[PDB]
Amino acid sequence: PEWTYPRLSCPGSTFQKALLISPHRFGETKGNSAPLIIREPFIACGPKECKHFALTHYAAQPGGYYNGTRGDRNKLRHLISVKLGKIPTVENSIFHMAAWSGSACHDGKEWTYIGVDGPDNNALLKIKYGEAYTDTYHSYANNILRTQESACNCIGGNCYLMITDGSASGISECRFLKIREGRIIKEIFPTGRVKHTEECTCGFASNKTIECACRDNSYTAKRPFVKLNVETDTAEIRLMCTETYLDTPRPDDGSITGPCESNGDKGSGGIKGGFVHQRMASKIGRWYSRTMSKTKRMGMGLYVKYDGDPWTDSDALALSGVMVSMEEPGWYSFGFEIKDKKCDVPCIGIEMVHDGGKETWHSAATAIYCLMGSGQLLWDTVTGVDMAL
Amino acid sequence: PEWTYPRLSCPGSTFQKALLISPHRFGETKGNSAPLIIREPFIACGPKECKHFALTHYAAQPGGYYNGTRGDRNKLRHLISVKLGKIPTVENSIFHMAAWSGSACHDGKEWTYIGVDGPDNNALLKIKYGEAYTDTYHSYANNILRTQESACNCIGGNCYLMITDGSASGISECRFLKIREGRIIKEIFPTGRVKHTEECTCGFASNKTIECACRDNSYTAKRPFVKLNVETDTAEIRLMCTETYLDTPRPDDGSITGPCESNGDKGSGGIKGGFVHQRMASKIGRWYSRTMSKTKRMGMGLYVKYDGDPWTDSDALALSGVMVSMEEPGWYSFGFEIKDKKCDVPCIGIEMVHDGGKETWHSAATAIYCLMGSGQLLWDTVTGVDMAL
Amino acid sequence: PEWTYPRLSCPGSTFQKALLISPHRFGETKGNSAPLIIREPFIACGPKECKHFALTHYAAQPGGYYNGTRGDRNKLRHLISVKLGKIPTVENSIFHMAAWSGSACHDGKEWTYIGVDGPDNNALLKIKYGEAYTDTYHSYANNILRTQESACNCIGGNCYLMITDGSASGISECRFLKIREGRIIKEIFPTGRVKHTEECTCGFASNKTIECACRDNSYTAKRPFVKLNVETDTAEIRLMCTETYLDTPRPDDGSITGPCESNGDKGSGGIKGGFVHQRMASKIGRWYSRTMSKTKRMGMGLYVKYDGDPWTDSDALALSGVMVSMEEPGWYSFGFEIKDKKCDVPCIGIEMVHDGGKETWHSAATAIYCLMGSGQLLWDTVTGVDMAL
Amino acid sequence: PEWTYPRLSCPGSTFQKALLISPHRFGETKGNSAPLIIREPFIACGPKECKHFALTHYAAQPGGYYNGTRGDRNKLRHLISVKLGKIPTVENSIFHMAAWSGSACHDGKEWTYIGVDGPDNNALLKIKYGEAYTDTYHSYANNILRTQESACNCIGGNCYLMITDGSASGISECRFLKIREGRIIKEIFPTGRVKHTEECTCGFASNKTIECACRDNSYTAKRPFVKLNVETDTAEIRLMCTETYLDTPRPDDGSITGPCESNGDKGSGGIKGGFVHQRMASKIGRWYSRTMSKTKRMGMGLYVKYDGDPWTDSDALALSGVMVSMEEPGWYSFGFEIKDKKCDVPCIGIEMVHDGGKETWHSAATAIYCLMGSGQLLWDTVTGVDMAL
Numbered sequence A, B, C, D: 001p002e003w004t005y006p007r008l009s010c011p012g013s014t015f016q017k018a019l020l021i022s023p024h025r026f027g028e029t030k031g032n033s034a035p036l037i038i039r040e041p042f043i044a045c046g047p048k049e050c051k052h053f054a055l056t057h058y059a060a061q062p063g064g065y066y067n068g069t070r071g072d073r074n075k076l077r078h079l080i081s082v083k084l085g086k087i088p089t090v091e092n093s094i095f096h097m098a099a100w101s102g103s104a105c106h107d108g109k110e111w112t113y114i115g116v117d118g119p120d121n122n123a124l125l126k127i128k129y130g131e132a133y134t135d136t137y138h139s140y141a142n143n144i145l146r147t148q149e150s151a152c153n154c155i156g157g158n159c160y161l162m163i164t165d166g167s168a169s170g171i172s173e174c175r176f177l178k179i180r181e182g183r184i185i186k187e188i189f190p191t192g193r194v195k196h197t198e199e200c201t202c203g204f205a206s207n208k209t210i211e212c213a214c215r216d217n218s219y220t221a222k223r224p225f226v227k228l229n230v231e232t233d234t235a236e237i238r239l240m241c242t243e244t245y246l247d248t249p250r251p252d253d254g255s256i257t258g259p260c261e262s263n264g265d266k267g268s269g270g271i272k273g274g275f276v277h278q279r280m281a282s283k284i285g286r287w288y289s290r291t292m293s294k295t296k297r298m299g300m301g302l303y304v305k306y307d308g309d310p311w312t313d314s315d316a317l318a319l320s321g322v323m324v325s326m327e328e329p330g331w332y333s334f335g336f337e338i339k340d341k342k343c344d345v346p347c348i349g350i351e352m353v354h355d356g357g358k359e360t361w362h363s364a365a366t367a368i369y370c371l372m373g374s375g376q377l378l379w380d381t382v383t384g385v386d387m388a389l
């Protein structure tokens, strides 16, 4: 085969509901199935197939290992995948590696699978290229080394990946790695607004540039926004200037007072956010998602803006549609791209967590929406699960 | 590969029982299986494989989501498929897209998957070519935009598809779309008898012509009959003239008084009907199916006529055989064609619904019959399910 | 690819235990599995893969459809297959066609699947070549038209198959069909001892000749023995002359008084028997199996003789080994051949039925033995099932 | 394709936790899964895929066949495999052959599968090349003929395999077989320290030499160490001289008094041990594993030494890390190698048995660790199973 490159995007001007993967529809006590207990789902596509990835707790519903299934980190956690369209069950899924933080991508020839493992103070990023484990990367701040929980991005064979290390409540200065046939050939140290960046959702703006919309878990409700030049291997981060704050929790739109870089208030905590590019011949669409509630992980709206500089443009993003109603859960979101025959189709995934607290099972559905045709986004998504079944 | 074209049909002069897919044979409380709760099954074949499609309620038997499983439209409904011959279970099936109305076909190179989604007043036809979502089509009468629930038909790369929009009890003027590598490149507006046409079962009479036997849900028990010329992309509809009324409910054969186009009575409601072509060197066989009961969805007989014009020929269709006994359920039927090495094999599928009303589970089996050898059709089909197990 | 031909057999001079497929090891009430309820299992191999076939009752254990699972013929019965080595479960299996009698073979290019269906007085042989149903054959004695329940045999593209029609207690004069790309191109009418022949187990003695060891269900305990010349398409049947009577029930060896063709006594009823060829450069081995008990379907021994004419040679077959102990069930047996890189490996399968009578479940295991190395056959086979679990 | 050869090893200088396969995470009474009851797991990799092998008792958890599931040898035991990364369940697994002792390898073209079967006094080694059973080998000491329970090793098409025969408590003089396209073309009789050698874990030191670290079950806690020259087909065994005794049970390191060959005390019983090669341009790493407890099968540490002669070098192996804590079970270990694009990645597997005694179920998890990056080994492995669920 040949190395993948970003192409121009397929025709269209709205997103529509594509696909729901709700594995706990079949998790009943009175049923006969074994859906895997997961969180942090994401999707990544190669020239022939799309894979649906997740981090499992190594437990099924129904079952007896519900306890600890609300934590993030433990020695059983694993990166798993099914072909997108298959329900992620005990039998359908393939286990790639131990991990409580994850990424994966296809370079045109082969899959790269990334998983972070180990103790909180000395955790370890691990790289699998196909079947072969091929490299690692050590914790540099000794406080929960971490990666994206969404697809990495490859071009001409170089796959690019955000990592971060630091306190969830303080400084977490991310870096980027450049990975080629599964080995780290370069380290990139961003400049600019670097205080706290984690869970970057990234994609290609062009053959020169990768961008990402990230999460500040401590300081601000504005998403940190990465521009990485892949020709010089240099990166700069600044906050998104829009009044449409995309993190949760957040304050009311436009109420953060100051120039583009101000923080200011109700910006502790956060959430991973969907972000995807619509690349046209003389114009670029940036697509984003965020929660319907300003405070809780309920609902998910889709927004878009075409062109401008997100670092300096304070104008609202344009509401396109409600993807998940306020009455339904809306936790992490991510972007990804499907390869049609001659163009790329942008999409946004949504993690819909079934949360009853730590004294029952904790898992998620996944809702997908993608650019298709014209007009407005038309229908919303429900998980359909009753957690007591 | 290369684009598919209709060929001449394989030798034979009767249909025989081929294959039963009865997934609820394994749906017992005392069993360990997970058959998917479906309705509107259909089959479509490519150069190497046949796929068995259906619309699932995203629920299994045994299980706890039986409620609402008798409705047609909801936000969980999905187009799903297995390789024909596999039982459609939670694990075997692949989920293609959200949908409460469906079609699919293979053009020789790739699969096209069609699914209609959304609210009743502003629903949305969605097209997937392989992995990529590639186009849509908007509701034009704002009353339950709908498609065939059977295979679309491709030639030299153009795949043809009926849609319809309108009141189930009044006007539903269908159109046809011409789809190529998953994008709509033409709209066809039929002329002639257009009042109410839905659930068209279509196939190729030749390299010039596609025909379809459709359902009038309001006005008549005669099936509306489409002739679509694929060289000029034009279509005309008239009612079938035969005394052998193929819809259910219906009145006694030959009792509709008038010329070929009269309606007249007990023609409210309806059912999707099987229809398939037997193409010979200097002759054409048209194969049809209909319910044994004149009023209820019980039984299914197979009929045939060779040549003539169905628009103007009032003569009876020739009873070939009882495919499902009166004592067994017989709901939707469809036609399809399997590719043998140098010729096409015509077939008819039969949806056999397990119906106990809305206070239990609602799903279906699928019975297949195909042209094979000579003589008479020999055996009938039972689902073998006891719904209380 | 290219057409298959029989080659010379791989080196060796004993059979050994190869493989047990015991699906009811996982059929417990306290388990979570769904093994298919089958009988008449058999195996057939192509250039790349071996398929394990069976006739299912369309019911699993554990489950609620045990009743009728001891009969042979009904409208739910089906030919099913898994890759040999896989457990035949609801999900693993593929359903080929409705059938209560079965055969299948691979010609080098594609699989041919055969299934007999229909009413007792007017039953129907059906042929599937790959996905396509391609031909049939009508009942000629109107009394349970039937086929082999073991592999058919192809050469240069012509696949040969025994069928039979007639009373299980009287005359059942078999014929042979010659099938090519799934269509019957010739009918062969054997001559000689033709009174009663059914369930023929066949294979190639050479590029000219096919032989078979069959069952007489009415008249004799000597197996009828077919020699079919594939160059002239002619066939002759005579009884096996050996004192080692291979049917069950039978009388003590050598106690049938008379020349080679005498019947005489305790020859009602019968059983399908294993038979396979070991083809060498200047010598031919014939391998056979039979039940340890003279009267009941308990145990299974393996015997061999090299060269001679089975029609006229009254000498004992040479006991090679006990494949199933007297304490274990031993019902049908069959022969088959696995393709190694440059030679064919002969094998014998054994159906081991779990029989508690008609008021519980009725299914089978399958035990395989094959030519491998030298010396004596070393171990026997148990199903390991407790039917009350 | 082409024959496999050992290449130089991929860059790195530590092992890290790669992958846990814990099938009994889903074996609960309150679950819906069917993990196969196994022991003696091992892994073997070909140019495109890695297979995870094991010997099953032909029983699942949950289920009713727990009794006898703590013995080694019986007539139901089988060699089974899944693609590495898949959970070994009733449905996922493929059954290769009857066996209570096992090996397998890929020569670059095809898989060779080895299984020992039969009675204790006259057991039988059986070889399958692809689908074809192709050879055997007879018991030469009439006391539990046995093989490695780990991967065999192929080069230029010749695959090399240890076997052994003799009392578990006395003499068990092993030999090596040279197998090519599945037939034994040579027998190798080692010289030197031959009293007791079994369960050899082997790999290539080079294109000339294969080495193995074996088990003495009777006489000593020093692992017997095989050097086999593949150019002359000759082999010599001596004990490992290191003070770091690798068997269990064992005495305290360095406490066996004498020259390199002394036995002396607490050397009855034993365990199969992990061993794998790191081949560099001018240097060789030998990697080993052993149990944390000196007496019980609890924990598992990883050790390494670079260069020297293991026969004569008494120096300690270098502790690299704790792979399994003392509080967790640690039974058999093995080495294997994954093929990256241009180099080989060394790995060690660990069998973690769930042992509650013979009055419940007896099975195992499998933990994998592999050379990846630099620094120290960072995290340990737990099965996470509660055997009462």
Ligand SMILES: *[C@@H]1O[C@H](CO)[C@@H](O[C@@H]2O[C@H](CO)[C@@H](O[C@@H]3O[C@H](CO[C@H]4O[C@H](CO[C@H]5O[C@H](CO)[C@@H](O)[C@H](O)[C@@H]5O)[C@@H](O)[C@H](O[C@H]5O[C@H](CO)[C@@H](O)[C@H](O)[C@@H]5O)[C@@H]4O)[C@@H](O)[C@H](O)[C@@H]3O)[C@H](O)[C@H]2NC(C)=O)[C@H](O)[C@H]1NC(C)=O
Residues within 6 Å of the ligand: A005, A006, A007, A008, A205, A206, A207, A279, A281, A342
């Ligand atoms: C990252 O860089 C990529 C490489 O630069 C870029 O890929 C290009 O994308 C554009 C989309 O705007 C495509 O241009 C379109 O071309 C089609 C017709 O396609 C045929 O013509 C092109 C060349 O025409 C143009 O370029 C030449 C110089 O190369 C000029 O002289 C001329 O002025 C034209 O503007 C030809 O190269 C194509 O060949 C490719 O595609 C075919 C079929 O798809 C393949 O079979 C073949 O292997 C090869 O890949 C093709 O025959 C036209 O209808 C449109 O109007 C438009 O001009 C290019 O095809 C494409 N180039 C290549 C080399 O693939 C990515 O878009 C860019 N990504 C991003 C996100 O910026």
Ligand SMILES: *[C@@H]1O[C@H](CO)[C@@H](O[C@@H]2O[C@H](CO)[C@@H](O[C@@H]3O[C@H](CO[C@H]4O[C@H](CO[C@H]5O[C@H](CO)[C@@H](O)[C@H](O)[C@@H]5O)[C@@H](O)[C@H](O[C@H]5O[C@H](CO)[C@@H](O)[C@H](O)[C@@H]5O)[C@@H]4O)[C@@H](O)[C@H](O)[C@@H]3O)[C@H](O)[C@H]2NC(C)=O)[C@H](O)[C@H]1NC(C)=O
Residues within 6 Å of the ligand: B005, B006, B007, B008, B205, B206, B207, B279, B281, B342
């Ligand atoms: C839609 O249009 C299709 C294209 O027009 C049409 O396909 C044709 O179907 C007919 C069935 O009646 C086939 O004709 C049959 O031919 C076989 C022997 O096959 C060989 O001969 C043909 C050509 O012979 C005829 O046509 C030529 C002009 O083309 C005349 O001079 C002459 O008078 C003959 O009547 C040859 O083209 C075939 O080649 C095809 O098939 C081979 C093997 O199958 C392939 O390897 C090859 O790639 C190619 O596809 C072949 O060598 C004869 O025994 C029969 O009696 C009959 O005459 C045609 O093969 C076929 N044509 C093509 C180009 O495929 C579809 O039937 C039509 N569909 C419908 C529903 O109407």
Ligand SMILES: *[C@@H]1O[C@H](CO)[C@@H](O[C@@H]2O[C@H](CO)[C@@H](O[C@@H]3O[C@H](CO[C@H]4O[C@H](CO[C@H]5O[C@H](CO)[C@@H](O)[C@H](O)[C@@H]5O)[C@@H](O)[C@H](O[C@H]5O[C@H](CO)[C@@H](O)[C@H](O)[C@@H]5O)[C@@H]4O)[C@@H](O)[C@H](O)[C@@H]3O)[C@H](O)[C@H]2NC(C)=O)[C@H](O)[C@H]1NC(C)=O
Residues within 6 Å of the ligand: C005, C006, C007, C008, C205, C206, C207, C279, C281, C342
């Ligand atoms: C059904 O008929 C088949 C065709 O007649 C027959 O197949 C033959 O089986 C015999 C087994 O005894 C094989 O003969 C063996 O040959 C190997 C070395 O193989 C190479 O040599 C042969 C030809 O040698 C003989 O024949 C020629 C005339 O053809 C004579 O002059 C000469 O005296 C020899 O006796 C050659 O054809 C082979 O080529 C085949 O095999 C190779 C590799 O396997 C393939 O790559 C190739 O495509 C082709 O298939 C080969 O190069 C020798 O070591 C043995 O001692 C033995 O003589 C034949 O190979 C084989 N013939 C063919 C054409 O395949 C079946 O056995 C028969 N079946 C039964 C049950 O009777």
Ligand SMILES: *[C@@H]1O[C@H](CO)[C@@H](O[C@@H]2O[C@H](CO)[C@@H](O[C@@H]3O[C@H](CO[C@H]4O[C@H](CO[C@H]5O[C@H](CO)[C@@H](O)[C@H](O)[C@@H]5O)[C@@H](O)[C@H](O[C@H]5O[C@H](CO)[C@@H](O)[C@H](O)[C@@H]5O)[C@@H]4O)[C@@H](O)[C@H](O)[C@@H]3O)[C@H](O)[C@H]2NC(C)=O)[C@H](O)[C@H]1NC(C)=O
Residues within 6 Å of the ligand: D005, D006, D007, D008, D205, D206, D207, D279, D281, D342
């Ligand atoms: C078992 O034996 C194997 C065969 O002897 C041996 O394989 C060799 O392993 C070494 C690792 O040290 C490789 O050498 C490395 O080469 C790369 C660049 O690769 C290219 O160059 C080599 C030849 O260069 C050397 O040898 C020639 C004589 O052959 C000398 O004149 C010269 O002084 C050099 O030292 C060339 O053969 C390679 O071609 C192979 O690889 C390519 C791509 O991988 C394939 O496409 C091709 O089919 C072929 O397999 C290649 O173009 C260099 O960067 C390193 O510094 C190092 O020198 C060899 O490639 C490799 N040889 C072969 C024939 O594969 C195994 O290592 C040995 N195993 C063990 C455990 O001992």
Ligand SMILES: [Ca+2]
Residues within 6 Å of the ligand: A215, A216, A217, A218, A219, A220, A221, A247, A248, A249, A267, A268, A269, A270, A271
């Ligand atoms: Ca925040």
Ligand SMILES: [Ca+2]
Residues within 6 Å of the ligand: B215, B216, B217, B218, B219, B220, B221, B247, B248, B249, B267, B268, B269, B270, B271
């Ligand atoms: Ca009507």
Ligand SMILES: [Ca+2]
Residues within 6 Å of the ligand: C215, C216, C217, C218, C219, C220, C221, C247, C248, C249, C267, C268, C269, C270, C271
């Ligand atoms: Ca008899």
Ligand SMILES: [Ca+2]
Residues within 6 Å of the ligand: D215, D216, D217, D218, D219, D220, D221, D247, D248, D249, D267, D268, D269, D270, D271
């Ligand atoms: Ca010892």
